[PDB]
Design a protein around this ligand. Structure first.
Ligand code: CHL
Ligand code: CLA
Ligand code: CLA
Ligand code: CLA
Ligand code: CLA
Ligand code: CLA
Ligand code: CLA
Ligand code: CLA
Ligand SMILES: CC1=C(/C=C/C(C)=C/C=C/C(C)=C/C=C/C=C(C)/C=C/C=C(C)/C=C/C2=C(C)CCCC2(C)C)C(C)(C)CCC1
Ligand SMILES: CC1=C(/C=C/C(C)=C/C=C/C(C)=C/C=C/C=C(C)/C=C/C=C(C)/C=C/C2=C(C)CCCC2(C)C)C(C)(C)CCC1
Ligand SMILES: CCCCCCCCCCCCO[C@H]1O[C@H](CO)[C@@H](O[C@H]2O[C@H](CO)[C@@H](O)[C@H](O)[C@H]2O)[C@H](O)[C@H]1O
Lengths: 733, 194, 37, 186, 75, 80, 95
């Protein structure tokens, strides 16, 4: 039999091409490998994590190297407002001379790509000023990548493999990760800001060669050890400070100004220094909570066992959950993806409205790409969070050990949960779509005053509570007599209120009826996607149509045409259907973010306010209007620098449409077609001398759903990425 | 049973009859679990005893002309010095928190380890009013009824001040001046549509 | 010291785009087809 | 009942007292695998042996009037160029250390080049083994004291001691940690 | 808001009354494809007081089925 | 090879055996049902996984179950 | 404020209440961790890293070992600097 795959004898004995495809697709499902034990499972995962870490630091090293080698960082730092950053050089032998000239720009030697990832603003903010600064960082991270790779090898060796119990010491790992991984890293990052980043923003060079002889503050550590910590907040950078120079600069290293630096339109460095110092203290303290070898602290099992409501409303409460969580990796992975997935959305939300990197706001293409980038990644992570929660129920859930606790009771009323999610999705869809169609008919008939425009009073009321005085609610921070206004009036409100009432920045943009409709469409996306994913998990173990679904696994094709038909009945298929709704939801979010910002960046916000209340406005004034430059990247008269995005735009449409083939036409058609191809090859003279070793067959039922979904997603992403960058960059960049 | 909160109703089974101050009032059945009721029984007495001290203290300050209960801690803000009965006190806010935190931790920690004692007696009853242990039923009923009354009164102090801004004694004087024109129905706050 | 030569793309782009893929595909094709002893 | 680092503390089981300087000090229980404790014991001496020479070298250089301070020696230029020094050191140290490791694996003791143990003068006994560790530990603590005192006081070891002796209460860690601008502004 | 809910509850309550009415018949399925118009008109007019009738069913406990009389999948 | 299991709720209707298009199943004597016969799966190496047997089983839930497993020339239904 | 008085004063209070007030309560809650049981039952190096290999015995009558001193001393230092830092914010110009 064939060697590959070495981890499954069932695959290795398959004489068809399914062996190749399935061998690739089951490589990282360690639990399903032949001869796998629990202890070997954890040691492989530990080794794999070292590999991922080494790739991350190597990928970062490659970015640093190419910007220094081929970028214009040293030129960009001089005039960041009027210089486009360079990502890397182009050496494409297929280029013609017009293409070579078209992509030559920014004073570069030859063709180059413009960066959109914002690394220039990030690196410039944290104190990098020269190409040699980037070169040393690149070599340092390449070395760090090597060390992690060695550690991955080291801990696979006979005397360094941790035992199974080592991976299940929950109290000790939480203490270290909270205090050391989070707390000390944040404390160390405060050291960089106080010692390097802040001085570099004030025109003083601090490097490894002189940082031991430079005083971060004129009073060196006397305020710190004497408790007079307020001395570090005196004489902050003035409003006239020019970033990177000593004119208008101050001396404070810890402040709470609370606003935006007037020139860079980004958060103050002294606030970001005090921010990281504050959480570092909290995280170091929080890391002394759990039991270890020293006789103090909590044991997490005791905490869970205690929290049972005395009235029996939650049944057994949280009894038995410690083993349920501590023994299942899919439960832990589901909690990790759900938490990280939400934080990825939070990063996108807060970075566009509280830009932390100098000159990030004015780079419109970078801001658009960064928000879209992280929202699409958050969407994928959330779908994975529910997928592994569904896998937990099939593989790791033990009904006997979870008898009567909160987890078991979720399955008890799963129909109630699914029924109510179904109602909310239907309600939002009916009325959200209905109002849009009503407004479209009114616009078509020429009566824009007959449409249903509902003021977002609840959201506009929140903005009033934060100090936005436009709506006249005179509430909390919007009223100058409230205690909330008075108490903070000496710490951060003067800066915060100044920024929130500036209508040229993205801090709490003004909202109207156009924002009301879009937000309710977003809710429909979240609820429907949750409905599909939640049903896939709660029904994973069985249903009326298939009472014993657990016996078949997480992913199987179907149960056949009997009992009416069971296509797409597994929990794997519920995730597969939910990915479509995730893309649809994130699409609505990113269209909404992009259109509301393009109108702001052009100064004509009225277009969004007027055209966003009906769906023809989106198609006409957003998709059609902003495609004009994209599709002219190359035309019968020539081409320009946008021809790559024009080409990638159609490239996306093609991959997307190809995915329809794997989703619409199913296996039986193709297997019978391949059988005539097998006949044709064998009877053809001069070709039947050559022969195959793996019998050709059609893709499997499950494989084609993944292959179709992969093409659908890739085409989805590449089409909008090309349009997002091209429309934003051509308009302003 | 000390009475019936809702005449004609049926007393809850889970409320023992001899429990002091038992009027059968438990619309939400919060005391259904015996263990929970035991904790609630202690908390009511402790809450009432603190409320009785607080209401007595709040009224005493304003009756003697030393301000209202709400203005008392303003010296620690503006920069003035503390005063008690007009006698100047030599401590400042940060110092006061030190004595209170240590003092209250000792007393409350000592009470906490007693495991739910609510009628200690002994050194806490020097005059021997409850030494009998048989006639204490009325005294326990009197304590809880005055305790519940004090708890309602203090909520009145907080609620009334948040609406009109005047002290409890000043509010009483204003009600008597114009009972029909000065009450909760005339705040402009309590009833939005009046 | 770090700056690579100006001719680096001329060698590395064909090397990583045409040469290494050819050897990688040949290595993988032989590996998957290889039969167990 | 040997003396222990903490009064009235029975030493942990994994520490038997056989090793030299065994005071039962292992609050984190790092040494509990017999295969690692033997490696750590050898690692303790070698770190101490390098510390003992380093402390003597810093003190000797200062007492003999060598300049600049021990933390500026690298900046100074010598007969051999700095580029040539490292290749010489790498080859020489690589040879000595590789043979240092090879002997340890075979014998389990410490030695030099091809001799394990390296005791030409025949001085060796449990007392000598104990004295080596205690003097070694003191040097390891001493060297870190030099490094930190250079950071804060920016004075050489003997120089710092003289200042403390001259003005014990006026000059100490309390003074220097609150006068970094003055000392570093000179 | 309260205008729509009255009509929406009217329609839903009338349909629920008809569905319960035919469950007692010999062949309920044939009473659903082929509507019993005389009964439907009778229930159509009585639905004007649905909010009163709906509340009284809730308080008497006949609005909801028992958990033990509803089929559910294995768990 | 796929896995085919017969459970003790079989009533011996023989419909699974008739439905099977590869003669994988057969009927054997039994005493656990009125028909005094039970379905058997002696030749699962020829099973292709069509699940026609499950379509034909009257009992609820099924008394014959097919669990698709390792693939081969026979189970993949190849004539080449 | 004088740091020596505030920091030492707060530490003394937190050590005093810890030794004399909450020592009994703290020990009882520590036994609630005994009901669950030990973390691991093994004899490998990595299993040994999860056991109380060293027991910190103390001659104090109440059993106020060094680990307890570090715990209650840390809270006193944390509270002491909070008091000093907040009081420092008074009379601060442009801060
Ligand atoms: C045993 C190890 C060892 C130790 C602890 C030191 C320690 C030191 N060396 Mg030294 N060196 C050591 C071995 C060696 N050094 C050098 C060559 C140098 C040079 C050339 C320099 C130092 C310098 C330094 C200092 C670095 C301060 C800093 O943060 O620079 C951070 C700087 C960068 C990361 C760049 C510090 C006192 C520097 C010094 O004395 O500065 C005043 C210095 O210029 N060392 C050689 C080659 C013979 C060594 C061989 O083993
Ligand atoms: C045993 C070695 C030793 C000795 C004899 C001295 C002696 C002196 N030191 Mg130095 N020092 C040492 C170690 C030592 N130091 C260490 C390890 C550090 C790093 C923390 C420092 C950091 C240091 C500074 C920052 C300063 C001095 C200063 C001084 C002088 C005044 C005393 C003082 O302020 O001490 C108080 C402060 C100390 C840190 C001394 C601690 C000494 C004890 C014995 C260390 C015990 C370590 C312990 C065994 C480790 C256990 C680890 C645990 C995890 C198990 C004086 C000449 C001052 C001076 O005037 O210098 C010119 C001064 O400014 N020392
Ligand atoms: C850190 C997070 C994490 C980790 C450790 C894992 C780990 C695992 N997952 Mg999970 N998963 C994650 C995130 C994670 N997942 C996310 C984010 C999602 C949502 C998308 C999912 C959704 C998911 C599903 C639905 C399933 C798993 C499964 C698995 C297991 C097998 C994986 C395997 O064999 O892949 C093999 C890998 C492949 C076949 C290829 C993966 C690459 C895809 C097809 C996209 C390729 C795009 C391509 C590069 C684009 C080219 C563009 C072109 C222009 C060049 C394994 C335990 C499977 C399992 O067995 O669970 C029990 C399973 O069914 N995961
Ligand atoms: C534009 C495409 C589209 C639309 C409109 C819908 C609509 C719907 N999907 Mg579907 N879905 C789509 C694409 C779409 N999907 C795709 C591509 C996939 C991937 C396979 C899925 C996968 C999917 C899943 C897995 C689920 C849904 C669900 C839903 C419902 C969500 C709740 C809702 O909006 O209720 C409001 C209803 C609508 C907006 C539907 C349209 C109503 C029209 C306008 C009524 C017109 C009536 C009028 C009198 C005219 C009739 C004329 C005729 C008689 C000739 C809804 C029925 C969820 C569901 O069923 O929840 C209950 C669900 O679980 N969808
Ligand atoms: C994962 C990080 C990463 C990525 C995605 C890229 C991507 C690219 N590199 Mg770069 N490169 C990186 C890291 C990376 N590089 C590092 C760390 C180095 C330092 C050794 C280099 C050195 C380098 C050179 C010298 C050249 C490129 C070039 C290229 C381009 C063509 C591919 C090629 O020839 O690679 C070649 C990659 C290597 C020689 C190093 C690979 C190292 C890993 C561990 C294998 C492409 C834009 C070419 C270019 O700019 O064309 C216009 C080119 O000539 N790279
Ligand atoms: C990074 C990948 C890559 C690279 C470096 C190239 C490079 C090239 N492609 Mg492209 N190509 C690629 C990927 C790539 N392609 C892919 C993926 C596709 C499919 C989508 C194509 C499809 C494609 C087509 C259809 C054509 C090209 C052509 C070309 C040539 C255009 C420039 C020219 O005028 O050459 C002129 C070429 C020469 C003067 C000769 C160059 C050297 C020859 C090709 C090989 C010499 C071998 C040597 C004698 C012996 C072995 C040496 C070896 C062991 C070191 C050039 C050789 C054009 C061409 O001319 O191809 C031959 C062409 O028609 N490519
Ligand atoms: C290179 C440093 C080093 C190393 C490897 C060791 C190793 C050892 N010591 Mg020693 N020790 C050292 C330095 C070192 N020590 C110093 C400087 C002192 C003086 C404070 C002592 C004082 C001391 C005592 C009193 C005792 C030991 C003992 C031990 C043994 C058991 C503990 C163990 O496994 O530690 C393994 C240690 C490590 C792997 C090093 C970890 C270092 C961390 C990562 C950073 C520490 C930073 C520091 C606190 C500042 C073991 C052979 C016990 C014994 O029985 O010895 C025979 C014993 O009783 N040591
Ligand atoms: C860890 C041990 C160690 C190390 C790494 C150094 C390193 C150094 N010493 Mg130091 N030294 C040490 C121990 C050490 N010393 C000891 C134990 C003493 C005896 C007290 C001295 C006495 C000493 C003096 C007197 C001088 C140095 C000097 C030097 C520097 C030049 C060395 C040279 O040119 O050697 C070349 C010579 C040989 C290889 C022959 C060695 C024969 C035995 C260099 C930074 C010189 C310097 O420039 O300092 C700033 C200097 O003046 N050292
Ligand atoms: C199925 C399953 C699973 C999964 C799950 C998931 C995936 C979930 C998710 C979830 C989620 C994803 C959630 C979230 C949530 C959230 C929240 C809950 C939030 C909250 C918030 C808050 C509360 C806030 C507040 C505030 C505000 C608003 C403002 C100001 C500030 C403050 C803070 C105050 C698992 C694994 C378990 C397993 C089993 C099964
Ligand atoms: C013997 C004896 C005695 C005495 C005793 C004593 C005197 C003691 C002391 C003790 C002490 C005196 C202790 C201490 C401790 C301390 C500690 C443990 C600390 C800690 C700290 C920390 C942890 C910190 C932290 C931080 C930082 C670093 C920065 C900022 C922030 C914070 C603050 C957080 C008596 C007579 C009583 C009795 C008899 C016997
Ligand atoms: C402005 C006013 C602010 C007031 C803030 C009050 C903060 C209170 C913090 C209490 C911290 C815990 O301290 C408190 O824990 C337990 C009660 O819960 C008591 O300890 C007791 O409590 C258990 C439950 O009642 C008993 O079964 C046990 O005998 C014992 O564990 C402690 O003796 C007490 O000190």
């Amino acid at each position: 039999t064939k060697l590959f795959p070495k981890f499954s004898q069932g695959l290795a004995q398959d004489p068809t091409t399914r062996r190749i495809w399935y061998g690739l697709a089951m490589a990282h499902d360690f639990e399903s490998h032949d001869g796998m034990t629990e202890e070997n499972l954890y040691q492989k995962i530990f080794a794999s994590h070292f590999g991922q870490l080494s790739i991350i630091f190597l990928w970062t090293s490659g970015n640093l190297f190419h910007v220094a080698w081929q970028g214009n960082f040293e030129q960009w730092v001089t005039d960041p407002v009027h210089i486009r950053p360079i990502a890397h050089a182009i050496w494409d032998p297929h280029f013609g001379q017009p293409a070579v000239e078209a992509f030559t720009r920014g004073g570069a030697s030859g063709p180059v790509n413009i960066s959109t990832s914002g690394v220039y603003q990030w690196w410039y903010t944290i104190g990098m000023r020269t190409n040699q600064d980037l070169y040393v960082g690149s070599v340092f991270l390449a070395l760090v990548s090597a060390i992690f790779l060695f550690a991955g090898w080291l801990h696979l060796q006979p005397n360094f493999q941790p035992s199974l119990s080592w991976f299940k010491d929950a109290e000790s790992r939480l203490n270290h990760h909270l205090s050391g991984l989070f707390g000390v890293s944040s404390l160390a990052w405060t050291g960089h800001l106080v010692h390097v980043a802040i001085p570099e923003s004030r025109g003083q060079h601090v490097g490894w060669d002189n940082f031991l002889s430079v005083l971060p503050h004129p009073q060196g550590l006397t305020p710190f050890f004497t408790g007079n910590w307020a001395a570090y907040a005196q004489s902050p950078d003035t409003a006239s400070h020019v970033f990177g120079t000593a004119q208008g600069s101050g001396q404070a290293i810890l402040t709470f100004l609370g606003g935006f630096h007037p020139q860079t339109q980004s958060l103050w460095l002294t606030d970001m220094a005090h921010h990281h110092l504050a959480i570092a203290v909290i995280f170091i303290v929080a890391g002394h909570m759990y039991r270890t070898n020293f006789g103090i602290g909590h044991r997490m099992q005791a905490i869970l066992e205690a929290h049972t409501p005395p009235s029996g409303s939650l049944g057994a409460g949280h009894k038995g959950l410690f083993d349920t969580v501590n023994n299942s990796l899919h439960f832990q992975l589901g909690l990790a993806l759900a938490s990280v997935g939400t934080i990825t959305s939070l990063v996108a939300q807060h970075m566009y409205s509280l830009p932390p990197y100098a000159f990030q706001a004015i780079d419109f293409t970078t801001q658009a790409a960064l928000y879209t980038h992280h929202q699409y990644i958050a969407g994928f992570i959330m779908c994975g969070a529910f997928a592994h929660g569904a896998i937990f129920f099939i593989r790791d859930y033990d009904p006997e050990q979870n008898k009567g606790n909160v987890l078991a009771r979720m399955l008890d009323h799963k129909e109630a949960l699914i029924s109510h999610l179904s109602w909310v999705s239907l309600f939002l869809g009916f009325h959200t779509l209905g109002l849009y169609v009503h407004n479209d008919v009114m616009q078509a008939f020429g009566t824009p005053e007959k449409q249903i425009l509902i003021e977002p009073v609840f959201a506009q009321w929140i903005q009033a509570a934060h100090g936005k005085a436009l709506y006249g609610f005179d509430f909390l921070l919007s009223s100058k007599t409230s205690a909330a206004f008075a108490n903070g009036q000496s710490l951060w409100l003067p800066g915060w209120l100044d920024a929130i009432n500036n209508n040229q920045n993205s801090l709490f943009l003004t909202i109207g009826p156009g924002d009301f409709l879009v937000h309710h469409a977003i809710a429909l996306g979240l609820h429907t996607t949750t409905l599909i994913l939640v049903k896939g998990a709660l029904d994973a173990r069985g249903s009326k149509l298939m009472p014993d679904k657990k016996d078949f696994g997480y992913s199987f094709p179907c149960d056949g045409p009997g009992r009416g038909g069971t296509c797409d009945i597994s929990a794997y298929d519920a995730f597969y259907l939910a990915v479509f709704w995730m893309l649809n939801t994130i699409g609505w979010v990113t269209f909404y973010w992009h259109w509301k910002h393009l109108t702001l960046w052009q100064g004509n916000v009225a277009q969004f306010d007027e055209s966003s209340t009906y769906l023809m406005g989106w198609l006409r004034d957003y998709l059609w209007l902003n495609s004009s430059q994209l599709i002219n990247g190359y035309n019968p008269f020539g081409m320009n620098s946008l021809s790559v995005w024009a080409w990638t735009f159609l490239f996306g449409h093609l991959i997307y449409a190809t995915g329809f083939m794997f989703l619409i036409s199913w296996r039986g058609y193709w297997q019978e077609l391949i059988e005539t191809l097998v006949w044709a090859h064998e009877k053809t003279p001069l070709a039947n001398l050559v022969y195959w070793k793996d019998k050709p067959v059609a893709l499997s039922i499950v494989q084609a759903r993944l292959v179709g979904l992969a093409h659908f997603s890739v085409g989805y992403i590449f089409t909008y990425a090309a349009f997002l960058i091209a429309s934003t960059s051509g308009r302003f960049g | 049973k000390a009475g019936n909160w809702l005449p004609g109703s049926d007393a809850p089974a889970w409320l023992p009859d001899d429990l002091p101050g038992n009027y059968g009032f438990d619309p939400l059945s919060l005391g259904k679990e015996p263990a929970s009721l035991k904790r609630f029984t202690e908390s009511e007495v402790i809450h009432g005893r603190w409320a009785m001290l607080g209401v007595a203290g709040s009224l005493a300050v304003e009756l003697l002309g030393y301000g209202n209960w709400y203005d008392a801690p303003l010296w620690a803000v503006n920069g003035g010095k503390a005063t008690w009965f007009g006698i100047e006190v030599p401590f400042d806010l940060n110092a006061l928190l030190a004595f209170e935190f240590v003092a209250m931790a000792a007393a409350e920690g000592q009470r906490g380890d007693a495991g739910g004692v609510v009628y200690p007696g002994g050194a806490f009853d020097p005059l021997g009013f409850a030494k009998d242990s048989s006639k204490s039923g009325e005294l326990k009923l009197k304590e809880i009824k005055n305790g519940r009354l004090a708890m309602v009164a203090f909520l009145g102090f907080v609620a009334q001040h948040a609406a009109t801004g005047k002290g409890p004694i000043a509010a009483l004087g204003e009600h008597l001046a114009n009972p029909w024109g000065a009450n909760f129905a005339t705040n402009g706050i309590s009833v939005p549509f009046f | 010291p770090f700056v690579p030569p100006s001719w680096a793309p001329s060698v590395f782009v064909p090397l990583t785009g045409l040469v290494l893929p050819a050897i990688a595909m040949a290595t993988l094709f032989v590996y998957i087809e290889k039969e167990a002893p | 009942a040997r003396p222990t680092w903490l009064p009235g503390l029975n030493p942990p089981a994994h520490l038997k007292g056989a090793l030299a300087g065994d005071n039962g000090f292992d609050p984190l229980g790092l040494g509990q695998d017999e295969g690692r404790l033997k490696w750590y014991a050898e690692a303790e001496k070698t770190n101490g042996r390098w510390a003992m020479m380093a402390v003597a070298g810093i003190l000797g250089q200062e007492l003999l009037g060598v300049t600049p301070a021990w933390w500026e020696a690298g900046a100074k230029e010598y007969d051999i160029p700095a580029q040539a020094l490292t290749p010489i050191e790498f080859i020489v140290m690589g040879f000595l250390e590789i043979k240092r490791y090879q002997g340890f694996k075979q014998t389990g003791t410490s030695g030099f080049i091809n001799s394990f143990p390296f005791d030409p003068a025949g001085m060796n006994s449990p007392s000598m083994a104990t004295k080596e560790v205690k003097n070694g530990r003191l040097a390891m603590v001493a060297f870190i004291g030099f490094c930190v005192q250079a950071l804060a006081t920016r004075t050489q070891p003997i120089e710092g001691l003289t200042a403390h002796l001259a003005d014990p209460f006026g000059k100490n860690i309390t003074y220097y940690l609150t006068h970094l601008p003055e000392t570093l502004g000179s | 808001t309260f205008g729509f809910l009255y009509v929406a509850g009217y329609i839903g309550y009338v349909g629920r009354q008809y569905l319960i009415a035919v469950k007692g018949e010999a062949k309920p399925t044939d009473k659903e494809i082929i509507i019993d118009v005389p009964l439907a008109t009778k229930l159509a007019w009585q639905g004007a007081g649905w909010p009163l009738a709906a509340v009284q069913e809730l308080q008497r406990g006949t609005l909801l089925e028992k958990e033990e009389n509803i089929t559910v999948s294995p768990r | 090879a796929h896995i085919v299991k017969i459970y003790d709720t079989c009533i011996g209707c023989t419909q699974c055996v008739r439905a099977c298009p590869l003669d994988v199943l057969e009927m054997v004597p039994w005493d656990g049902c009125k028909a005094s016969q039970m379905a058997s799966a002696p030749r699962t190496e020829d099973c292709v996984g069509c699940k026609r047997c499950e379509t034909a089983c009257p009992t609820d839930f099924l008394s014959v179950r097919v669990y698709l497993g390792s693939e081969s020339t026979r189970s993949m239904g190849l004539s080449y | 404020l004088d740091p020596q008085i505030v920091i030492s004063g707060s530490t003394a209070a937190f050590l005093a209440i810890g030794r004399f007030v909450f020592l009994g309560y703290q020990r009882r809650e520590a036994n609630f961790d005994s009901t669950v049981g030990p973390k691991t039952t093994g004899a490998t190096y990595f299993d040994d890293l999860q056991k109380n290999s060293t027991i910190f015995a103390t001659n104090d009558p109440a059993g106020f070992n060094i680990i307890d001193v570090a715990g209650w001393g840390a809270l006193g230092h944390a509270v002491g600097f909070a008091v000093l830092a907040i009081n420092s914010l008074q009379g601060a110009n442009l801060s």
